[PDB]
Structure formats: C-alpha cells, structure tokens
Amino acid sequence: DQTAEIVIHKRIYRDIDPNNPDKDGYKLLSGLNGANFEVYDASSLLKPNMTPEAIRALVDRYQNMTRKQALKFARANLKLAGQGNKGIGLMNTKNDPTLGEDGISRITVSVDQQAPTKAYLMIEVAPDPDLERKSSPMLVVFPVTDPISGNPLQTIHLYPKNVGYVRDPYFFKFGVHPDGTSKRLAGAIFAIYRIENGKKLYLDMSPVTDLRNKWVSTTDPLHDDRVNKFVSDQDGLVNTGERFLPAGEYFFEELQGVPGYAIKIEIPDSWEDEDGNRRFVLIDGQPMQENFGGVVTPEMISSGYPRVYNYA
C-alpha cells in the first residue's frame, strides 16, 4: 500500500524534540557521517482510535528511555523493518549528493496516512570505526500532518543530537608607547600551533571534517597558504571566529608584527568544575571571558580584555 520516507540528519551541536533542526538550547557547529541506526516496527505499540495526546504520551515514554534500554526492549519484542541503506531496518549516515549534506540516512517504511496505525522505533547503535553521541530513541508515529497543509507529511526529517565540546579563544592586541598612551593595533598576523610529540604543528586551513581540526608541520607559517592566519582588526581583536579548539594547550604565534613593534592558550576540558565554578580559557595566564556560543560580543570588544601589550 502506502509508503513514507524518514530522513535522518546527523549533525553536531553545542550545548547552550527530534523534529526541530533549530534545536532550542543548542546550536550547530560548522554533517556527521558513519552513525548507525536500527529501526523497529513499533505498530504493535499502537491502539485503534488512540488520541493525539496518547500518541504524544507514548512518544515521550520511549524518547526518555536510554538507547541501551530501548534496544533491549525492541530486540526482545520487535522486528527490524523498513528499507534502509544498509539493510532491513539498518541505517548508516552518509553523504547525500542530492541534498549536498553529510550525515544523511534514508529509510522507506510502510505507513497509513489516514489513521495512526503504523509507527517505527529508531535507535542509534555503534558508529563505524571525544564526542558525546546523545541521540535518543525516536518513535515516529504516522500519519504526521504538516502544520501548513493539514495533510499528512510524506517525508519525516529527524535531527538527532550529537554534542561536541569546544571553546573559542580570543584576545586583543594593544600597543603601549613609553609615554603610557596605548591603542588597539590593527594588522598583526598570528597563527596557532601546538607542541604535539615534541614538534610544532600549526592549525591549518583544512576543513573541519567531523569535529576534528587538521594540523600541519611547516617551515614558514606566514606565507604557507595552508596555515590559518588570524589578523587583528580595527578594534585590535584577534579572534578564532569560526575556528574552535578542543581541550588542551596551544599558542598564538605572532608571524608579522605591527610596524614599530608566543601567547599561551590553556583550554580546560569542561565549562564547570565539580563545585559548579566556571572554568576559564587562559590567555597568557589571564582568564578569558567566554560564551557558550563562543561569539565575541560588542561588550567584550569594548572591554578589550584579555589584552597583550606590544612595546615600541
């Protein structure tokens, strides 16, 4: 009879409802390939003529189970179902050349668009050979009417949540004259390196595949087009911007100083300690104000802190 398509969009979010790609309380990073899901026919969980409220109550029950709990239930009681890309009931996230998106996986399932008699339970399993894979058991109950048309949806889009821990270093470069006056310096050229295995590797311009940055050894970071450069702006701000870093120790290296004139970055592995106190990124030992969103605000720019002083 009738079929519908369920499309999983596996993406990576930052901390501070499976149908919303604009998850409230979360924000997209940069698609995540290699995630795997098992899909079970959960139609036997439904009753004829059940209310929308009863469906919502049922969806919440399964959504609030852990994945291990949901697999134990489904494996014992349900059967794999649906035409997935790895097999019956088996979904692997891949690049979608049509959508131009990573993290895509599509499964075709039999549905009843006239009455709620078909439902499917979707649970993430082990990925393909530091990330919190926080997807939940997703109970998809058909028909799902779209709000605009009042008609049942023929395609369901799901956006399971995976959360990556990252932070966003920045600082302001100021120049200080011997007479005590001072100003923001524009045009300072920086790169970022780390001391991996006793050698310097510089943060390169390679795309953020997954959550991972790529790192290169170089003989000449300033003119190597592969090495991401960070330029102080008219407010003196040197900002990682779209670039982020995971936990660890790194350095801002000045590659071209401002005419007339080794910054440590310490990134803690959590936002808060055991005692609820904020853990700061340190810039040359100075605590660096920071948002969960990692955006350098106008107030941070006006504040101008942390500042690095360059002597004429």
Contacts of the segment 261-266: beta carbons below 8 A, 24+ positions apart: 261/175, 261/185, 261/310, 261/311, 261/312, 263/171, 263/308, 265/169, 265/192
Question: What is the phi/psi pair of residue 81, to 5°?
Answer: -155, 155
How crowded is residue 127: how many other Cβ atoms within 10 Å of its Cβ? Answer: 16
Largest CA distance in the chain: 84
What are the C-alpha distances in Å from 288 to residues 156, 235, 306? Answer: 42, 17, 6
Question: 202 with 250: CB under 8 angstroms?
Answer: no
Contacting residues for 18 by C-beta, under 8 A, at least 6 apart? 63, 136, 138, 158, 159, 160
> Hey, is 88 helix, strand or coil?
strand
Question: 45 with 57: CB under 8 angstroms?
Answer: no
Q: Which helix (H) or strand (E) holds 163?
A: strand 161-163
Q: Which helix (H) or strand (E) holds 54?
A: helix 52-63
Q: In sequence order, which ranges of the chain are alpha helices (DSSP H)?
A: 52-63, 67-77, 298-303
**Residue 37: CATH number of its domain:** 2.60.40.10
Contacting residues for 56 by C-beta, under 8 A, at least 6 apart? none
CA–CA distance, 303 with 286 (Å, rounded to integer)? 14
Resolution in A: 3.2
- Side chain identity, residue 150: G
Strands 286-288 and 281-283, by their bridges, are: antiparallel
Range of the domain at 8: 3-164
Question: 266 with 246: CB under 8 angstroms?
Answer: no
DSSP conformation class of 181: -
Q: Compute, in degrees rounded to 10, the torsion defined by CA atoms 264, 270, 272, 274.
A: -120
Number of H helices, E strands in the chain: 3, 24
Tokens 């499964």 label which residue? 107
CA–CA distance, 1 with 72 (Å, rounded to integer)? 30
Copy the structure tokens of residue 51: 């209310």
CA–CA distance, 268 with 205 (Å, rounded to integer)? 24
DSSP conformation class of 297: -
DSSP 167-217: B--EEEEEEE-TTS-EEE----EEEEEEEETTEEEEEBS---BTTB--EE-
Nearest 5°: CA angle at 262, between 222 and 247? 100
